[PDB]
């Protein structure tokens, strides 16, 4: 729990350019762990905001022509500011439009973490999630987080598999979108984040989910979501250490 | 409960072009009944998405000049793909802007279900909800669903009145907007849906509402909403069949 | 509780041009006290809607180029219609982009209530220390009711300044609490372009007392469960609870 303590004390400004289905939830998730979310989308204020921010989330969930050039521009402004970017290529394998855009973005800007499910990361690189993550790491030289039944993180010389969470998470819209935000919350302006911050980010989210789903007042996916936020807000070190399941670790 | 069982097993890709106040709630209500919502608004991906989707919801709740040509373009893409459209002409009677746009949309594309309240449907056509629904059906030759104190569905030669639900539903924003999305979830790519699918869609939503409002942890409109989602998620055949209150006119 | 009773009965149409993070919550908060929220953003329908509406909220939380000209246009349509505007200059102090826009808006239209935190109101007047002093300086510049939210809230309208001391710390941990409060204030205007300070005190007090009561509920387990409870509490709030809890001081 080292990084989450710091988020609660320092309240890191976390800029989110995210999709319209999950903006509120993302912001509430970030507030619950003690970050300071800001959903700024205007390239006109990116330079001023990014000087003082700790990370940027770019999530293309509801990509449209209105967003494309603005996303490219703010990614460049982030790179020039030294602001780390968490990129979520939502449903990139579902259309050529999203594929072509994600290729353009990743040619145009360096991101610090690419986060997606196996199908999304596979689609970016053109099979085990670990193999897909390592291939993506070799192509982008950027931390890769692949969410799934077990989560996989590849960063630097390590690959790790994590095994926490609840099935109710799949039934809440934007769970993995909120995870992108949480990961941005853990970066503290490090453009090459320590794998330990990414492990903590993913573990905090998934452990909170596990605990929320066991709460006696969790009656389904509607009641789960408020509980998940409560649980993120209250999560303590004892619970984190008792529950964390980090299942394999591979050093290159 | 035939169709709901199929939603839960097949997880139908349900495209929703909806308004900015209700996107999250709509996606969560669709996820709760087992559908796979996708809020795609880019005409550039409509052809790919629609080929594999089961329905499209078009809801004009926050219509602006940024949306108008895109909505027309995607509705045409949907027709070409055989993807059925559910159209919600939100607040159409409140402005000439919305009236003109809904007229344009309905001259540009064939829709599969038109859903609104009595005042919205009346404004489309220009006193009883049943009469209004039957007049609209005669104009558009498209299933009409009028939500209200009692709901009315008219499809082909049948008209039905349903009498389930809760007053709390009006106090949760986008209830009816979510209903539009639930209806889209029950279409399974049928451009002329069976009246039984529409009856089930409306009935599942309303009965879930009724049951959520009776829950001992429902303390008002704020706790009602998460309960509604739980109740949609858990709704079973037994409860459906015990509670459903339907009449053929 | 006077004005809240009228909201419950009259169901005032409350137009909200607000930010994308808080639309749904704002709308639900307005529904819970009995208002009729409408998130209309198209200038093409503003004249027709505004003729029948009771207030407009303008909140610039997620300002972009797509919004700028539209906001200016609707604000002018509101003035012409006699529709009172509640303006929330979110994060104005965080960029020159927002500062320039808020200066343009307030040179282009007359608003009826300006609501923000101390740092937001300060940035408005600086770019023209105590929250009371800030509120009075802003009132002098704009001749418009000022509401400054904070640990204690401040309201300045005409010759009166009031400090209110209700609420809960969980409100800060729910996104868009104060954004919703902008909406609630709009709900309490009833087409009065110079609202009585009493309406503003009630609007702020209803919200903060409901927050206080929600946070005491035995089912409140944190900021996730708090938000549904806040809505329930707004729905149920009664005069007995309001009069027992309200903590107000005239400066
Ligand atoms: C639902 C839905 N549709 N779209 C396009 C997105 C990004 C979502 C949320 C996924 O969790
Ligand atoms: C609230 C509100 N405003 N607008 C324009 C819409 C469609 C809503 C939700 C209605 O349930
Ligand atoms: C979070 C967040 N980001 N932005 C830009 C806005 C207006 C918010 C909601 C603050 O309550
Ligand atoms: Mg993803
Ligand atoms: Mg409708
Ligand atoms: Mg403010």
Numbering used by the authors:
A (entry chain A): 1 to 126, 140 to 265
B (entry chain B): 1 to 126, 140 to 262
C (entry chain C): 1 to 128, 140 to 262
Which sentences did the original study use to describe this structure?
Here we report a detailed structure-function analysis of the kinase ThiM, which phosphorylates THZ in one of the first steps in vitamin B1 biosynthetic pathway. The quaternary structure of SaThiM is a triangular homo-trimer with dimensions of approximately 72 Å on a side and 47 Å thick with three independent active sites, each located within interface regions between two monomers. The following β-sheet strand 7 is antiparallel to strand 6 and following β-sheet strand 8, which is antiparallelly flanked by β-sheet strand 9. This fold of the phosphotransferase ThiM is homologous to that common to the group of ribokinase-like folded kinases. The three active sites, each located within the interface regions of two monomers respectively, are homologous to other known phosphoryl transfer ribokinase-like kinases.
Out of this in silico selected set of molecules, two were chosen as the most promising analogues for further investigations: 2-(1,3,5-Trimethyl-1H-pyrazol-4-yl) ethanol, hereinafter referred to as compound 1 (cpd 1) and 2-(2-Methyl-1H-imidazol-1-yl) ethanol referred to as compound 2 (cpd 2). The structures of these complexes could be refined to 1.87 Å and 1.62 Å resolution with R and Rfree values of 16.86% and 19.90% for the cpd 1 complex and R and Rfree values of 18.24% and 20.28% for the cpd 2 complex. The thiazole moiety was replaced by the non-sulfur containing heterocycles pyrazole and imidazole for cpd 1 and cpd 2, respectively. Moreover, cpd 1 contains two additional methyl groups at position 5 and 6 of the heterocycle (respectively). The overall coordination of the THZ analogue compounds in the active site regions of the ThiM trimer is remarkably comparable to that of the of natural substrate THZ. Both compounds form a H-bond to the amide nitrogen of amino acid M39 and show a similar orientation of their hydroxyethyl groups. The activity of ThiM was analyzed in vitro, as described in the methods section, showing that the specific activities of cpd 1 and cpd 2 are approximately 1.5 times higher compared to THZ, however show only 1/10 of the efficiency (kcat/KM) in comparison to the natural substrate THZ. The two novel compounds applied for co-crystallization in this study lack the thiazolium sulfur, present in the natural thiazolium moiety of thiamin, which is replaced by a carbon atom, supporting slightly higher flexibility in the active site in consequence of the reduced van der Waals radius. Moreover, cpd 1 has two additional methyl groups bound to atoms 1 and 2, which can provide more hydrophobic interactions in binding co-factor dependent enzymes after complexation to the HMP moiety by ThiE thereby enabling the cpd 1-HMP moiety to act as a competitive inhibitor.
